[PDB]
Design a protein around this motif. Structure first.
Motif, PDB file in Angstrom:
ATOM      1  N   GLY A  27       0.763  -1.239   0.000  1.00 25.01           N
ATOM      2  CA  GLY A  27       0.000   0.000   0.000  1.00 25.01           C
ATOM      3  C   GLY A  27       0.795   1.292   0.000  1.00 25.01           C
ATOM      4  N   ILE A  28       1.727   1.439  -0.938  1.00 26.07           N
ATOM      5  CA  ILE A  28       2.471   2.681  -1.125  1.00 26.07           C
ATOM      6  C   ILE A  28       1.718   3.522  -2.152  1.00 26.07           C
ATOM      7  CG2 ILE A  28       4.728   3.707  -1.641  1.00 26.07           C
ATOM      8  CD1 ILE A  28       5.972   0.992  -1.276  1.00 26.07           C
ATOM      9  N   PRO A  29       1.352   4.769  -1.839  1.00 23.96           N
ATOM     10  CA  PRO A  29       0.681   5.600  -2.846  1.00 23.96           C
ATOM     11  C   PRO A  29       1.647   5.985  -3.945  1.00 23.96           C
ATOM     12  CG  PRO A  29       1.231   6.949  -0.942  1.00 23.96           C
ATOM     13  CD  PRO A  29       1.658   5.525  -0.604  1.00 23.96           C
ATOM     14  N   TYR A  30       1.147   6.013  -5.179  1.00 24.71           N
ATOM     15  CA  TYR A  30       1.964   6.423  -6.312  1.00 24.71           C
ATOM     16  C   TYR A  30       1.352   7.567  -7.108  1.00 24.71           C
ATOM     17  CZ  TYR A  30      -0.976   3.575  -9.620  1.00 24.71           C
ATOM     18  OH  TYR A  30      -2.028   3.040 -10.367  1.00 24.71           O
ATOM     19  N   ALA A  31       0.220   8.123  -6.668  1.00 22.43           N
ATOM     20  CA  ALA A  31      -0.421   9.250  -7.333  1.00 22.43           C
ATOM     21  C   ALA A  31      -1.329   9.951  -6.336  1.00 22.43           C
ATOM     22  CB  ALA A  31      -1.234   8.808  -8.558  1.00 22.43           C
ATOM     23  N   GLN A  32      -1.658  11.196  -6.638  1.00 17.39           N
ATOM     24  CA  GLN A  32      -2.713  11.865  -5.897  1.00 17.39           C
ATOM     25  C   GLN A  32      -4.012  11.091  -6.073  1.00 17.39           C
ATOM     26  OE1 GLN A  32      -2.877  16.257  -6.614  1.00 17.39           O
ATOM     27  NE2 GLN A  32      -0.845  15.863  -7.511  1.00 17.39           N
ATOM     28  N   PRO A  33      -4.761  10.841  -4.998  1.00 14.77           N
ATOM     29  CA  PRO A  33      -6.046  10.152  -5.123  1.00 14.77           C
ATOM     30  C   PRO A  33      -6.910  10.813  -6.183  1.00 14.77           C
ATOM     31  CG  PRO A  33      -5.471  10.344  -2.828  1.00 14.77           C
ATOM     32  CD  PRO A  33      -4.405  11.094  -3.590  1.00 14.77           C
ATOM     33  N   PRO A  34      -7.413  10.053  -7.147  1.00 18.86           N
ATOM     34  CA  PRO A  34      -8.136  10.673  -8.271  1.00 18.86           C
ATOM     35  C   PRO A  34      -9.571  11.015  -7.894  1.00 18.86           C
ATOM     36  CG  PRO A  34      -7.983   8.288  -8.595  1.00 18.86           C
ATOM     37  CD  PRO A  34      -7.291   8.588  -7.285  1.00 18.86           C
ATOM     38  N   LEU A  35      -9.703  11.942  -6.951  1.00 18.65           N
ATOM     39  CA  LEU A  35     -10.940  12.250  -6.252  1.00 18.65           C
ATOM     40  C   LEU A  35     -11.463  13.617  -6.679  1.00 18.65           C
ATOM     41  CD1 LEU A  35     -10.209  11.085  -2.612  1.00 18.65           C
ATOM     42  CD2 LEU A  35     -11.573   9.969  -4.323  1.00 18.65           C
ATOM     43  N   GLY A  36     -12.781  13.800  -6.577  1.00 22.99           N
ATOM     44  CA  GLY A  36     -13.408  15.075  -6.874  1.00 22.99           C
ATOM     45  C   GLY A  36     -13.200  15.549  -8.296  1.00 22.99           C
ATOM     46  N   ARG A  37     -12.578  16.721  -8.457  1.00 26.48           N
ATOM     47  CA  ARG A  37     -12.270  17.225  -9.791  1.00 26.48           C
ATOM     48  C   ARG A  37     -11.201  16.404 -10.511  1.00 26.48           C
ATOM     49  NH1 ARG A  37     -10.470  23.144  -8.938  1.00 26.48           N
ATOM     50  NH2 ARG A  37      -9.293  23.058 -10.905  1.00 26.48           N
ATOM     51  N   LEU A  38     -10.465  15.537  -9.803  1.00 24.91           N
ATOM     52  CA  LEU A  38      -9.525  14.623 -10.445  1.00 24.91           C
ATOM     53  C   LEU A  38     -10.191  13.367 -11.003  1.00 24.91           C
ATOM     54  CD1 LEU A  38      -6.339  14.804  -8.128  1.00 24.91           C
ATOM     55  CD2 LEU A  38      -6.884  16.030 -10.238  1.00 24.91           C
ATOM     56  N   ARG A  39     -11.439  13.067 -10.622  1.00 25.66           N
ATOM     57  CA  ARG A  39     -12.141  11.932 -11.216  1.00 25.66           C
ATOM     58  C   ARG A  39     -12.175  12.065 -12.734  1.00 25.66           C
ATOM     59  NH1 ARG A  39     -18.336  10.748  -9.615  1.00 25.66           N
ATOM     60  NH2 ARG A  39     -17.310  10.069  -7.681  1.00 25.66           N
ATOM     61  N   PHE A  40     -11.833  10.978 -13.433  1.00 21.44           N
ATOM     62  CA  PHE A  40     -11.773  10.808 -14.888  1.00 21.44           C
ATOM     63  C   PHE A  40     -10.504  11.425 -15.503  1.00 21.44           C
ATOM     64  CE2 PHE A  40     -16.566  10.976 -14.378  1.00 21.44           C
ATOM     65  CZ  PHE A  40     -16.761   9.621 -14.499  1.00 21.44           C
ATOM     66  N   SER A  86     -12.889   1.895  -3.093  1.00 25.28           N
ATOM     67  CA  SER A  86     -12.805   3.326  -2.887  1.00 25.28           C
ATOM     68  C   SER A  86     -12.268   3.903  -4.176  1.00 25.28           C
ATOM     69  CB  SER A  86     -11.884   3.677  -1.708  1.00 25.28           C
ATOM     70  OG  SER A  86     -11.654   5.072  -1.691  1.00 25.28           O
ATOM     71  N   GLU A  87     -12.589   5.164  -4.450  1.00 28.94           N
ATOM     72  CA  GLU A  87     -11.889   5.852  -5.534  1.00 28.94           C
ATOM     73  C   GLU A  87     -10.446   6.132  -5.162  1.00 28.94           C
ATOM     74  OE1 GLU A  87     -15.020   9.065  -6.249  1.00 28.94           O
ATOM     75  OE2 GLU A  87     -14.043   8.891  -8.216  1.00 28.94           O
ATOM     76  N   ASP A  88     -10.160   6.176  -3.869  1.00 21.77           N
ATOM     77  CA  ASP A  88      -8.813   6.402  -3.373  1.00 21.77           C
ATOM     78  C   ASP A  88      -8.142   5.034  -3.392  1.00 21.77           C
ATOM     79  OD1 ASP A  88      -6.469   7.004  -2.019  1.00 21.77           O
ATOM     80  OD2 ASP A  88      -7.485   7.484  -0.140  1.00 21.77           O
ATOM     81  N   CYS A  89      -7.580   4.676  -4.550  1.00 26.46           N
ATOM     82  CA  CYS A  89      -7.092   3.315  -4.744  1.00 26.46           C
ATOM     83  C   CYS A  89      -5.763   3.235  -5.496  1.00 26.46           C
ATOM     84  CB  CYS A  89      -8.152   2.490  -5.492  1.00 26.46           C
ATOM     85  SG  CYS A  89      -8.387   3.125  -7.171  1.00 26.46           S
ATOM     86  N   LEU A  90      -5.071   4.351  -5.746  1.00 31.38           N
ATOM     87  CA  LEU A  90      -3.859   4.314  -6.573  1.00 31.38           C
ATOM     88  C   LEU A  90      -2.655   4.022  -5.680  1.00 31.38           C
ATOM     89  CD1 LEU A  90      -4.436   7.013  -9.383  1.00 31.38           C
ATOM     90  CD2 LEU A  90      -5.173   4.601  -9.134  1.00 31.38           C
ATOM     91  N   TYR A  91      -2.505   2.742  -5.343  1.00 27.73           N
ATOM     92  CA  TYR A  91      -1.428   2.286  -4.482  1.00 27.73           C
ATOM     93  C   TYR A  91      -0.726   1.110  -5.158  1.00 27.73           C
ATOM     94  CZ  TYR A  91      -3.999   5.182  -1.102  1.00 27.73           C
ATOM     95  OH  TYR A  91      -4.683   6.219  -0.520  1.00 27.73           O
ATOM     96  N   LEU A  92       0.481   0.803  -4.677  1.00 26.45           N
ATOM     97  CA  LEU A  92       1.251  -0.318  -5.193  1.00 26.45           C
ATOM     98  C   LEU A  92       1.912  -1.067  -4.032  1.00 26.45           C
ATOM     99  CD1 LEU A  92       4.533   0.542  -5.070  1.00 26.45           C
ATOM    100  CD2 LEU A  92       3.792   1.965  -7.009  1.00 26.45           C
ATOM    101  N   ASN A  93       2.409  -2.263  -4.345  1.00 23.09           N
ATOM    102  CA  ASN A  93       3.028  -3.161  -3.383  1.00 23.09           C
ATOM    103  C   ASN A  93       4.421  -3.543  -3.862  1.00 23.09           C
ATOM    104  OD1 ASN A  93       0.252  -3.645  -2.042  1.00 23.09           O
ATOM    105  ND2 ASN A  93      -0.022  -4.488  -4.128  1.00 23.09           N
ATOM    106  N   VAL A  94       5.323  -3.750  -2.904  1.00 18.55           N
ATOM    107  CA  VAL A  94       6.691  -4.173  -3.186  1.00 18.55           C
ATOM    108  C   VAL A  94       7.038  -5.330  -2.247  1.00 18.55           C
ATOM    109  CG1 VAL A  94       9.069  -3.420  -3.516  1.00 18.55           C
ATOM    110  CG2 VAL A  94       7.197  -1.755  -3.785  1.00 18.55           C
ATOM    111  N   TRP A  95       7.525  -6.432  -2.817  1.00 18.45           N
ATOM    112  CA  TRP A  95       8.092  -7.546  -2.058  1.00 18.45           C
ATOM    113  C   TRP A  95       9.557  -7.619  -2.427  1.00 18.45           C
ATOM    114  CZ3 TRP A  95       3.258  -7.938  -4.303  1.00 18.45           C
ATOM    115  CH2 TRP A  95       2.189  -8.271  -3.457  1.00 18.45           C
ATOM    116  N   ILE A  96      10.426  -7.395  -1.453  1.00 16.81           N
ATOM    117  CA  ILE A  96      11.854  -7.485  -1.724  1.00 16.81           C
ATOM    118  C   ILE A  96      12.431  -8.650  -0.929  1.00 16.81           C
ATOM    119  CG2 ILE A  96      11.762  -4.972  -1.956  1.00 16.81           C
ATOM    120  CD1 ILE A  96      13.777  -4.786   0.380  1.00 16.81           C
TER     121      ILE A  96
END
Ligand SMILES: *[C@@H]1O[C@H](CO[C@@H]2O[C@@H](C)[C@@H](O)[C@@H](O)[C@@H]2O)[C@@H](O[C@@H]2O[C@H](CO)[C@@H](O)[C@H](O)[C@H]2NC(C)=O)[C@H](O)[C@H]1NC(C)=O
Ligand SMILES: *[C@@H]1O[C@H](CO[C@@H]2O[C@@H](C)[C@@H](O)[C@@H](O)[C@@H]2O)[C@@H](O[C@@H]2O[C@H](CO)[C@@H](O)[C@H](O)[C@H]2NC(C)=O)[C@H](O)[C@H]1NC(C)=O
Ligand code: S8K
Ligand SMILES: *[C@@H]1O[C@H](CO[C@@H]2O[C@@H](C)[C@@H](O)[C@@H](O)[C@@H]2O)[C@@H](O)[C@H](O)[C@H]1NC(C)=O
Ligand code: NAG
Ligand code: NAG
Ligand code: NAG
Ligand code: NA
Length: 526
Positions: A27-40, A86-96
């Motif tokens: 769950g590392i964020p990689y972008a601003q949540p695409p919420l509100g005026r950022l939707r689409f 959730s629309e707040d979903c722009l996350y990624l995972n890392v396994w090292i």
């Protein structure tokens, strides 16, 4: 325990795997949540944080409609999101690997699900086994799906299309800026995905903006030239406008439509997505990739044909019964709870389901090429023919054709045919080697002895894992130590491929030659 990234510090968690240790950053964020005026809109770069971000559990899955045909059935429910939508979903995972690697090859997983569904947090996408066993770094990301990720008013940056593909792109971008801090080699990045994820991977091979963001590609049961994979500009607008009418957002100003769709609740958009097409199936790619002029500069069939793509090695493959899974989502006479012996009349009814806008002659041509029986009294004839029709048309022949065209421009390509049916498979036996059921072998779940796979399955996954990793690391999917069958390159003349099964790994040629001449040379005319 703590890695400093370009945007801030993140804390991981230790996992015990096979008497070893893997470090997961979930769950590392990689972008601003695409919420509100950022939707689409295309995904926006993330501003720094000052704290330590805690990456110790999977983040939210992106908003999506859920498969509901088999409540309580693990065969369907294993694919449903297992974290909050959730629309707040722009996350990624890392396994090292632990200890932290020096310059480890990176595997980046892109999930499928028709571009309408899916999530990186599924159990079968757990990259901790790959990190433990092969000392590669596994990354996976959530990306927007459905209308929220692919609604298109082409040219209009309020809703340009391909957002979810730019989500993927921004995550590959993150791996480039950041993965060295985790012990990863950004110069050795292999994309892999399945179904719409494999289609995604092939579109990254086509997209100029992704060319510097990865090294090699793996396509499991999917490619952009599959008939479900790219929505036309005509269709995409009709679907956008139909969603608008369905939500009271019809306007003359196209930008006003978008602003209207921004004030609807995620659930009203989701409820009306299914109905933007008249040929309405639970397997409609209602909102998917389009030629946006940004991610995709031209129609991808043209770029493929004229060599306009990243020159690199590909690993491509398909499963033996790609088509069967989709028959219990609408075809008459089919059920996962019986052997689905269908008659001629039910077969013909099935073609109308899966080929809705096709002429009568087109449908008869399918019946003609698939009903010339080795034995006409065998009762499973029509049941198995409809499965092969759906699988050859939607997956096997588009992947073969992609491999042929890609290799004709001088790159090494390896093709596999996966024919092992999982011993733990909860779907009935008539559905065979189902779409999506190589994924667990690829991620090495049979390597866990406690998970009641057979011994032969553990060895098959172990060999597959080795070949995937050797391909990612060295561009060559051999297993060199255990007197394994050598995997030859796929050339458009001889078209050699490797079969994957528990008994014998064989080299064959010209998979589905007869069926794919029909699908690729005749059927596109009808
Ligand atoms: C393009 O879209 C029109 C309109 O779609 C209808 O309205 C939407 C809100 C949604 O509810 C869809 O399911 C509707 O079909 C399509 O026109 C319809 O076509 C069907 C049969 O094809 C017909 O029975 C409806 O009466 C039509 N409705 C209207 C308003 O025209 C059209 O088929 C779509 N495709 C093309 C190529 O035009
Ligand atoms: C296999 O099952 C299908 C689905 O029927 C449903 O699922 C069953 C497992 C059982 O729970 C039934 O009570 C359900 O109706 C059967 O398809 C139906 O067949 C009957 C008679 O042929 C017909 O009246 C229905 O319209 C069919 N429903 C459809 C097509 O959705 C099918 O006949 C079964 N076949 C065998 C060989 O068992
Ligand atoms: C999840 C993966 C991809 C691994 O496995 C499967 O999804 N399955 C396995 C068994 C459970 C089922 C789950 N699915 C739920 C809804 O997800 C979709 C919606 C819409 C079009 C989708 C999908 C999926 C492919 N498509 S499709 O390739 O575009 C296609 C469309 C029409 C005919 C043939 C293929 C199915
Ligand atoms: C981030 O995590 C810090 C450390 O928490 C430790 O690990 C987690 C998984 C728990 O088991 C906890 O009991 C441990 O102490 C927290 O101290 C810190 O508050 C967290 N930060 C935020 C913003 O939640
Ligand atoms: C990692 O490998 C690349 C070449 O693939 C090299 O240029 C880079 O300096 C290496 N970094 C290390 C070993 O830290
Ligand atoms: C409405 O249309 C005008 C021009 O037709 C243009 O400014 C824009 O697309 C819309 N206006 C706003 C404020 O979004
Ligand atoms: C090769 O065989 C040995 C046993 O002789 C086994 O332990 C090992 O896992 C195998 N390796 C691969 C990559 O299949
Ligand atoms: Na033919």
């Amino acid at each position: 325990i703590i890695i400093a990234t370009k945007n801030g510090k993140v804390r991981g968690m230790q996992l015990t795997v096979f008497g070893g240790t893997v470090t997961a950053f979930l769950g590392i964020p990689y972008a601003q949540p695409p919420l509100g005026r950022l939707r689409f809109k295309k995904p926006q770069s993330l501003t720094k944080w000052s704290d330590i971000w805690n990456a110790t559990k999977y983040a939210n899955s992106c908003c999506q409609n859920i498969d509901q045909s088999f409540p309580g059935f693990h065969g369907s429910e294993m694919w449903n999101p297992n974290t909050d939508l959730s629309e707040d979903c722009l996350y990624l995972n890392v396994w090292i690997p632990a200890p932290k690697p020096k310059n480890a090859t990176v595997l980046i997983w892109i999930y499928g699900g028709g571009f309408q569904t899916g999530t990186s947090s599924l159990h079968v996408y757990d990259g901790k086994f790959l990190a433990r066993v092969e000392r590669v770094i596994v990354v996976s990301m959530n990306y927007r799906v459905g209308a929220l990720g692919f609604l298109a008013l082409p040219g209009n940056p309020e809703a340009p299309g391909n957002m979810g593909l730019f989500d993927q792109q921004l995550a590959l971008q993150w791996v480039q800026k950041n993965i060295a801090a985790f012990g990863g080699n950004p110069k050795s990045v292999t994309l892999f995905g399945e179904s719409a994820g494999a289609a995604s991977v092939s579109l990254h091979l086509l997209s100029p903006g992704s060319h510097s963001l990865f090294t090699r590609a793996i396509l499991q049961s999917g490619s952009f030239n599959a008939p479900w994979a790219v929505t036309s500009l005509y269709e995409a607008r009709n679907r956008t406008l139909n969603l608008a009418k369905l939500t009271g957002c019809s306007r003359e100003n196209e930008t006003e439509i978008i602003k209207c769709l921004r004030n609807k609740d995620p659930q009203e958009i989701l409820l009306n997505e299914a109905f933007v097409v008249p040929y309405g199936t639970p397997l409609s790619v209602n909102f998917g990739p389009t030629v946006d002029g940004d991610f995709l500069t031209d129609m991808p069939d043209i770029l493929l044909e004229l060599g306009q793509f990243k020159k690199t090695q590909i690993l491509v493959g398909v499963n033996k019964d790609e088509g069967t899974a989709f028959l219990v989502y609408g075809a008459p006479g089919f059920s996962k709870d019986n052997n689905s012996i269908i008659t001629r009349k039910e077969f013909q009814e099935g073609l109308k389901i899966f080929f809705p806008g096709v002429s009568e002659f087109g449908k008869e041509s399918i019946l003609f090429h698939y009903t010339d029986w080795v034995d006409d009294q065998r009762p499973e004839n029509y049941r198995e023919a409809l499965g092969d029709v759906v699988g050859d048309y939607n997956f096997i022949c588009p992947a073969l054709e992609f491999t042929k065209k890609f290799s004709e421009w001088g790159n090494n390509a390896f093709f596999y045919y996966f024919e092992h049916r999982s011993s733990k498979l909860p779907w009935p036996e008539w559905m065979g080697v189902m779409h999506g059921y190589e994924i667990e072998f690829v991620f090495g779940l049979p390597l866990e002895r406690r998970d009641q796979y057979t011994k032969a399955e553990e060895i098959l996954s172990r060999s597959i894992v080795k070949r995937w990793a050797n391909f990612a690391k060295y561009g060559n999917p051999q297993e060199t130590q255990n007197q394994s069958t050598s995997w030859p390159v796929f050339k458009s003349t001889e078209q050699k491929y490797l079969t994957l099964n528990t008994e014998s790994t064989r080299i064959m040629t010209k998979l589905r030659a007869q069926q794919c001449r029909f699908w690729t040379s005749f059927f596109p005319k009808v």
